């Protein structure tokens with residue numbers, strides 16, 4: 364019986380998601396218990412549906428550059444309310460949610476038996492959003508089959524890495540992050556050996 368939700372607002376967040384916001388229906392006969400959100404790809408087709416207690420929601424795991432038809436209905440103690448007029452929204456184009464290009468191959472200079480100096484430059488593009496931080500991985504080519512992450516974020520374009528094994532060959536690589544995610548790895552640095560203990 365109750366009217367459809369009012370003041371619906373939707374915006375594409377990124378390539379795979381959009382957020383939806385609305386107001387309580389006017390003059391409800393009974394307390395609103397929740398809402399039901401219906402959406403389908405874009406002549407109507409059978410839609411997916413999500414039930415939520417609040418007046419706003421984020422709809423994720425969508426396809427890039429695709430238009431969606433969205434409707435909302437409120438449910439109360441007297442059944443399902445009237446369904447709002449359909450709203451359309453398009454997820455961002457893939458070129459628009461790009462993560463940054465891989466940073467340039469880093470320069471490496473041995474410092475001690477357990478330390479190494481390292482520096483890098485950003486890539487040709489920051490992607491679709493400015494770089495927020497860098498990440499650094501390392502690997503011992505003689506024994507390791509996989510890269511190891513350094514669980515810190517760097518706003519500098521250089522750093523000194525400590526705690527390495529003495530008399531060991533190492534290589535290093537860098538990735539840049541924006542709000543859209545990680546870049547590919549930089550080229551690996553040239554092999555460099557720590558001083559023996």
Ligand SMILES: *[C@@H]1O[C@H](CO)[C@@H](O[C@@H]2O[C@H](CO)[C@@H](O[C@@H]3O[C@H](CO)[C@@H](O)[C@H](O)[C@@H]3O)[C@H](O)[C@H]2NC(C)=O)[C@H](O)[C@H]1NC(C)=O
Nearest residue numbers: 376377378379380381382421422423424425460542543544
């Ligand atoms: C595009 O937008 C969507 C929606 O904002 C992003 O997905 C969301 O990513 C966040 C952060 O990773 C997720 O939050 C996390 O959820 C669980 C606990 O519920 C846990 O992994 C973390 O503690 C954190 O709270 C959120 O669930 C997720 N929402 C989805 C998938 O619907 C997405 O990362 C954005 N970027 C891209 C490139 O798609």
